[PDB]
Amino acid sequence: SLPVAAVLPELLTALDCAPQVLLSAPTGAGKSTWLPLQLLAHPGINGKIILLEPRRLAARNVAQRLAELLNEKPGDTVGYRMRAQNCVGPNTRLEVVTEGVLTRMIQRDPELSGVGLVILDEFHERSLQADLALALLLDVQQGLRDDLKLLIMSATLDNDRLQQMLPEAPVVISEGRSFPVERRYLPLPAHQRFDDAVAVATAEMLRQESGSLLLFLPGVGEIQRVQEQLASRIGSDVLLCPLYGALSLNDQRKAILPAPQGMRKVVLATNIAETSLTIEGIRLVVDCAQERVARFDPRTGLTRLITQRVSQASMTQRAGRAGRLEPGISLHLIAKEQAERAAAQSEPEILQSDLSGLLMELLQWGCSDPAQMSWLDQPPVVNLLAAKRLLQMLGALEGERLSAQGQKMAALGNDPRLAAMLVSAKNDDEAATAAKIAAILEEPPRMGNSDLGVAFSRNQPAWQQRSQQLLKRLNVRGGEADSSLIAPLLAGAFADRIARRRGQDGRYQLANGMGAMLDANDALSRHEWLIAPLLLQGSRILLALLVDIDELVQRCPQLVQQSDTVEWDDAQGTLKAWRRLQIGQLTVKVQPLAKPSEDELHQAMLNGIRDKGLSVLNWTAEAEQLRLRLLCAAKWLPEYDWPAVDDESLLAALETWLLPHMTGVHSLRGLKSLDIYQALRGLLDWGMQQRLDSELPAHYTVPTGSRIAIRYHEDNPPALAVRMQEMFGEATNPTIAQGRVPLVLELLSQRPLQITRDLSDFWKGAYREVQKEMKGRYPKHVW
Numbered sequence: 001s002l003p004v005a006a007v008l009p010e011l012l013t014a015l016d017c018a019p020q021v022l023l024s025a026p027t028g029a030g031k032s033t034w035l036p037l038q039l040l041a042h043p044g045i046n047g048k049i050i051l052l053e054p055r056r057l058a059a060r061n062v063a064q065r066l067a068e069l070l071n072e073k074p075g076d077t078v079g080y081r082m083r084a085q086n087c088v089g090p091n092t093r094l095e096v097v098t099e100g101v102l103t104r105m106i107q108r109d110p111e112l113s114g115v116g117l118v119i120l121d122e123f124h125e126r127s128l129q130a131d132l133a134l135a136l137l138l139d140v141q142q143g144l145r146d147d148l149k150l151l152i153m154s155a156t157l158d159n160d161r162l163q164q165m166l167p168e169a170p171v172v173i174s175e176g177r178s179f180p181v182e183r184r185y186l187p188l189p190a191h192q193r194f195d196d197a198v199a200v201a202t203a204e205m206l207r208q209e210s211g212s213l214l215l216f217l218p219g220v221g222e223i224q225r226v227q228e229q230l231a232s233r234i235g236s237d238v239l240l241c242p243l244y245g246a247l248s249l250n251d252q253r254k255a256i257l258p259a260p261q262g263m264r265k266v267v268l269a270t271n272i273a274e275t276s277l278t279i280e281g282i283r284l285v286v287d288c289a290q291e292r293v294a295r296f297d298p299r300t301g302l303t304r305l306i307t308q309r310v311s312q313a314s315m316t317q318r319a320g321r322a323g324r325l326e327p328g329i330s331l332h333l334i335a336k337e338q339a340e341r342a343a344a345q346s347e348p349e350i351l352q353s354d355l356s357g358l359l360m361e362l363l364q365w366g367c368s369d370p371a372q373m374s375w376l377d378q379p380p381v382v383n384l385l386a387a388k389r390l391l392q393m394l395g396a397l398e399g400e401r402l403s404a405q406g407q408k409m410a411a412l413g414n415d416p417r418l419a420a421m422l423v424s425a426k427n428d429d430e431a432a433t434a435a436k437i438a439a440i441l442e443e444p445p446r447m448g449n450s451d452l453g454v455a456f457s458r459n460q461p462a463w464q465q466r467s468q469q470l471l472k473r474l475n476v477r478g479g480e481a482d483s484s485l486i487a488p489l490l491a492g493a494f495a496d497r498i499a500r501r502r503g504q505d506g507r508y509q510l511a512n513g514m515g516a517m518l519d520a521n522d523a524l525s526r527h528e529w530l531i532a533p534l535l536l537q538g539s540r541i542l543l544a545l546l547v548d549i550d551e552l553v554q555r556c557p558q559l560v561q562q563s564d565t566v567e568w569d570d571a572q573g574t575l576k577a578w579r580r581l582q583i584g585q586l587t588v589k590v591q592p593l594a595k596p597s598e599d600e601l602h603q604a605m606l607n608g609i610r611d612k613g614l615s616v617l618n619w620t621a622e623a624e625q626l627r628l629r630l631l632c633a634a635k636w637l638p639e640y641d642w643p644a645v646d647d648e649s650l651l652a653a654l655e656t657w658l659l660p661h662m663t664g665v666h667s668l669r670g671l672k673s674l675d676i677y678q679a680l681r682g683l684l685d686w687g688m689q690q691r692l693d694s695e696l697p698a699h700y701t702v703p704t705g706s707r708i709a710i711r712y713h714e715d716n717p718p719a720l721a722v723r724m725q726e727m728f729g730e731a732t733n734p735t736i737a738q739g740r741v742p743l744v745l746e747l748l749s750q751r752p753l754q755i756t757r758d759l760s761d762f763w764k765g766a767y768r769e770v771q772k773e774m775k776g777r778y779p780k781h782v783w
C-alpha cells in the first residue's frame with residue numbers, strides 16, 4: 001500500500017471531531033490518488049466531496065488517476081470541472097476542480113448543498129485561488145453548513161501560518177519512504193548559453209551516474225531548447241520525456257511511468273514535478289535553480305515575469321524528488337554559496353499578484369474590507385489600492401460598493417477587464433466579438449504573429465468552448481462576430497494600454513508611460529496607433545508586445561483629456577501656452593491655448609512649474625528658511641505631522657498649496673514675483689504654525705533683548721552667531737525644539753570668529769578668552 005494509509009484511521013477519527021483538518025505528508029504518499037477514494041467509501045462524511053487542484057496539469061491527471069483506481073473512466077463516480085469544460089454524471093459524488101471554478105461555485109451556491117467535504121490540495125504552494133477559497137469556506141462554516149468538513153492537504157512538514165490561523169484544528173502527519181540524496185552544486189559558466197550549459201551538465205551526469213534523471217526548468221521554451229541540445233550529447237538508451245501543459249496525457253504518463261527495461265529516461269519538467277506530480281524511477285535530479293515568478297507593478301498595472309533563483313524550500317523539494325526509490329543524487333546548477341544565500345521560502349502569490357479579480361470577488365460576496373477575512377497573509381495595501389483604482393476606471397465601483405455594471409462583471413466570474421469588455425457590449429454582435437476576444441486573451445496563442453485580428457479569425461476548439469460559455473452566461477442566443485468591433489470594446493477595458501509609435505522599427509510608447517516593442521518586421525509596425533492587451537515584461541527594461549490590434553484614433557470614444565501648460569522656455573526667449581489633447585500621458589494633439597479662462601492657465605502655470613522646477617518660483621530668504629525649518633521639525637519634533645517639503649511632494653501638491661494663493665496673478669511674470677512664504681506657511685494649520693514659531697523659532701532672544709536670527713540647515717545643527725557680550729545670562733546653553741537641539745553658538749560675530757561651541761560649559765574651559773584686547777570683563781555671571 002501507499003505510505004498515507006498508515007494515518008487513514010487517525011485522519012478519519014479527526015475528520016469527525018473538527019470542522020477543519022490539516023494533513024501533511026511528503027510527495028509520493030497518494031494524497032491525491034488514494035486518500036479521496038478512501039474518504040468516499042466512509043459513512044462519516046455525508047454528501048459529495050470536491051477536491052481542489054490549483055495547477056490543472058495535475059487536476060486532469062488526478063481525475064484520470066482516481067478514476068483508473070476504480071476502473072471508472074472518469075465521469076461515472078469521479079469527475080472534474082475545468083474553466084471551459086467539465087465531466088460529471090448523476091452517480092459522481094467526487095469532483096476535482098481547478099481554475100477558480102470553486103470560488104465561482106461558492107459564489108453561486110454559498111451553502112454548497114450536496115457537499116460534506118472539501119479538500120484543498122497542494123496548499124503549501126500558497127496559490128491565490130486556494131487562499132480565496134479557504135476564506136470563503138471558513139465564512140461558509142459560520143452560517144449554515146456547520147456540518148461541512150474541510151480537509152487541507154499540505155506536503156511540507158512545517159506549516160507555520162496555517163496552525164497560526166486554525167490552531168484548534170487537528171494536525172495529522174505522515175512519514176516514510178525517504179532515502180538520502182547526495183547534494184551537489186555546479187555553478188553554470190557565463191560564456192555558455194543557458195540551454196547549452198544545462199544540457200552539458202545533464203549529459204555529464206548521465207555519463208557519470210546511473211539511473212533515470214529528473215530535470216527542473218523554468219518553462220516550456222527552456223524545456224524545448226534544452227531537449228534539442230540534449231539530443232546530440234546523449235546516447236541511444238536515453239528517452240527524453242518533456243512534461244508541461246498537455247501533450248497527450250500519454251507521453252505525460254510516458255514521463256511519469258518508469259522507463260521500459262533496458263532504457264533510462266530524462267524527464268524535463270517545470271516545477272509541476274516539484275510536488276504536484278510523482279515521477280517514477282528517478283534517482284538523479286538536475287535542478288537549474290532558476291524559476292519564473294510573477295510580480296504585479298501598481299505603477300504600470302502589469303504583472304511582469306521575473307526569472308529568479310529558487311528558494312531553499314523548493315531546492316529541497318527537488319532534491320527529495322530523487323530519493324523515493326533508493327539513495328540518489330541532486331545536482332543544483334548554482335554554487336553552494338549562492339544556494340546557502342537563497343531565499344528561505346517562496347513568497348505567497350497573494351503578496352505579489354493583481355487583486356482586481358480578488359477585490360471584485362470579495363465585493364460580490366458582500367465584504368466591506370478585503371482584509372476582513374481569514375487570510376494566512378493579509379492582502380498588501382498598495383495592491384488593494386491599485387485594484388480599487390482599476391475597478392473605478394472600469395465603472396465597476398459606486399463609492400465603496402459594487403455598482404450595477406460592477407455586479408454584472410462580478411457575475412461573469414472573469415478577469416475584471418475582460419468582464420467589463422463583455423458587459424459593455426450593446427448588440428449581440430458586439431457581445432460575440434467580446435466573447436471570442438476574451439477566450440483568446442485568457443488562453444493566448446503561441447503563433448509567430450502578434451496581431452489580434454488573425455487570432456480572432458484563426459480557429460480554435462477551446463476558444464470557441466469558452467466563448468459559448470461566456471455567451472450563455474450573458475444570455476445572448478444569436479449574434480455574429482467580425483473583427484471591425486475588436487477595437488472599440490478594447491478601448492473600454494485596455495484604455496491604459498493604447499500605444500503610439502516612436503519612429504519606425506516599431507518600439508512604441510504606452511498610455512501608462514512605459515513603451516513596448518514589437519519585432520522589427522511584424523506586420524503591425526506600419527501602424528501609428530496600436531492597442532496592446534497582452535504585454536510581456538520583467539527580466540524597468542522593455543516591454544515586449546505579445547498580442548495587440550490596430551487602431552485609428554479618429555472618431556474614437558470620449559476617454560481623452562486636456563492638459564494645458566504655459567512655460568516661457570528660454571532657448572528662443574518666448575512664452576509657451578500649449579493645450580495637449582492627450583489620452584493618458586500620450587499626446588494626441590497639440591494646439592495653442594488661445595483665450596483661456598483664469599482657472600485654466602492657473603492650472604496651466606501649475607503644469608509649467610511641474611515641468612521646469614520649483615526654482616521658477618520666487619524663493620525669498622524667509623521662504624528658504626521656512627523650508628529648512630520644516631525639514632528640521634520633521635526630524636526633531638516627529639510626534640506632529642509636519643507636511644513634507646521635498647521638491648517632488650510640493651510639485652505634486654501644487655494644486656492644494658500654491659493654487660489657493662494665486663487668485664489675482666493673471667500672468668507668468670506676476671507668478672514669478674509671488675512670495676511663496678505665505679503658501680508654504682499655509683501648508684500648516686493654525687497652531688502648527690504657532691508651534692513652529694515658538695519651537696524652532698526664526699530668531700533667538702539672547703539675555704539682552706536683542707533678537708538674533710538663527711541659521712537653519714538641511715544637515716547641520718542650527719547656529720546663532722551672537723556677539724557674546726550678550727551671552728552672559730547663560731541660561732543653560734540656548735536650546736530649541738522643546739529642549740532637544742541646542743543651538744550651535746558662534747560666540748563672536750566686537751570682532752568675530754574666536755570660538756564656536758555647543759555646551760556652554762567651556763566656562764571652566766574658555767580660559768583663553770580672559771585675555772581680550774582690553775580685558776575680559778566677562779567673568780562669573782555679569783549678564
Ligand SMILES: Nc1ncnc2c1ncn2[C@@H]1O[C@H](COP(=O)(O)OP(=O)(O)O)[C@@H](O)[C@H]1O
Nearest residue numbers: 026027028029030031032033034065275276278
Ligand atoms: N498515473 C500514475 N501511474 C503510476 N503510479 C501512480 C500514478 N498516480 C499515482 N501513482 C502512485 O501514487 C504515488 C504518488 O502519488 P500521490 O500519493 O498522489 O502523491 P501526492 O502525495 O503528491 O498526492 C506513487 O507511489 C505512485 O506509485
Ligand code: ALF
Nearest residue numbers: 031032155275276
Ligand atoms: F496531492 Al499532493 F503533493 F498533496 F500531489
